Design an enzyme around this catalytic site. Structure first.
Site, PDB file in Angstrom:
ATOM      1  CG  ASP A  35      -1.819   1.191   1.287  1.00 18.27           C
ATOM      2  OD1 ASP A  35      -1.920   1.904   0.271  1.00 18.27           O
ATOM      3  OD2 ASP A  35      -2.446   1.379   2.352  1.00 18.27           O
ATOM      4  CB  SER A 199      -1.974  14.268 -13.593  1.00 15.90           C
ATOM      5  OG  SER A 199      -2.338  14.007 -14.936  1.00 15.90           O
TER       6      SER A 199
END
Length: 330
Positions: A35, A199
């Site tokens: 994770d 992004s």
């Protein structure tokens, strides 16, 4: 040193991935959920409330000659999906894919919430976010990667998750045969403890690319892709009959649909998520309403590049003094 371990989807939907991890002496092998959105290595154990164990493999520290109680240390964690777990702490030897760390904090669960009990395939979590998020008190503990870093050939790990197939976590090296083209690296902020990056935009299907900054986290422990409501609405508007359902808890679409791809930007580069990766199947057994793999982050407070996005790429988690993330197509 290096390590290399195969990671395997837990079910036919790629809801999560499990990776075998050796703990203790003699080794006890548990299948952990790696994770990158959390920083605790915790396991089902001989200390877990019996009624909360249903098929998981357990760590028994009393059978490990290298286990030592970390005296006074406790832990307690709550995840974004509302699940939680807590317990006490041992140090022990932990190996992943041939890479060994001695003295790793192994957080033994005394209590786990129902979603963990109900998932017999996940024996615990191995956190790979920054150690500033580790929940051990009163002495915060380091992640497996933080402990291994100095010994690694290069201070990196890579995630290569498969679509409906096994994949690989590598530590200490970049497998240049595992991706196509070049790796594009992008800046990371560690201020929230996550592999947080920006992004450069998105496209839906064959549509034109929209240049816009989207701050979010690379999170292997989250199944889906969670993005701003504007972006998610633009995606689902291209699917006939798709709608946001408050009763189901997100966007659903007709199971008869063919989904468009979704592209996200990494600097000037582009990662394409095929439409099929966005199909999470019937909302309930036999339903013709299917659950979408791109969902709004509006209720989370952060955008999450979960498995839906990451499995379309070869992803480098670069833990150099100034961390960065790398993405390549594959």
């Amino acid at each position: 040193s290096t390590g290399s371990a195969t990671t395997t989807p837990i079910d036919s939907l790629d809801d999560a991935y499990i990776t075998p991890v050796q703990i203790g002496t003699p080794a006890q092998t548990l299948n952990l959920d790696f994770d990158t959105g959390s920083s605790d290595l915790w396991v089902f154990s001989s200390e877990t409330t019996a009624s909360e164990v249903d098929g998981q493999t357990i760590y028994t520290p009393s059978k490990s000659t290298t286990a030592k109680l970390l005296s006074g240390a406790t832990w307690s964690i709550s995840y974004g999906d509302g699940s939680s777990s807590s317990g006490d702490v041992y140090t022990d030897t932990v190996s992943v894919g041939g890479l060994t760390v001695t003295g790793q904090a192994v957080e033994s669960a005394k209590k786990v919430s129902s979603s963990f009990t109900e998932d017999s395939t996940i024996d615990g979590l191995l956190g790979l976010a920054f150690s500033t998020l580790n929940t051990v008190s009163p002495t915060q503990q380091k992640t497996f990667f933080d402990n291994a870093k100095a010994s690694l050939d290069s201070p990196v790990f890579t995630a290569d998750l498969g679509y409906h197939a096994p994949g690989t976590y590598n530590f200490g090296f970049i497998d240049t045969t595992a991706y196509t083209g070049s790796i594009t690296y992008t800046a990371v902020s560690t201020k929230q403890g996550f592999w947080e990056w920006t992004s450069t935009g998105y496209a839906v299907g064959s549509g034109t690319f929209k240049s816009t900054s989207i701050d979010g986290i690379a999170d292997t422990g989250t199944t889906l892709l969670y993005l701003p409501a504007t972006v998610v609405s633009a995606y689902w508007a291209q699917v006939s009959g798709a709608k946001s359902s408050s009763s189901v808890g997100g966007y659903v679409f007709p199971c008869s649909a063919t989904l468009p791809s979704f592209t996200f930007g990494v600097g000037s580069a582009r990662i394409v998520i095929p439409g099929d990766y966005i199909d999470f199947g019937p909302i309930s057994t036999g339903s013709s309403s299917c659950f979408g793999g791109i969902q709004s982050s509006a209720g989370i407070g952060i955008n999450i590049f979960g498995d839906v996005a990451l499995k379309a790429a070869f992803v480098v988690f670069n833990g150099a003094t100034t961390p960065t993330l790398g993405f390549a197509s594959k």
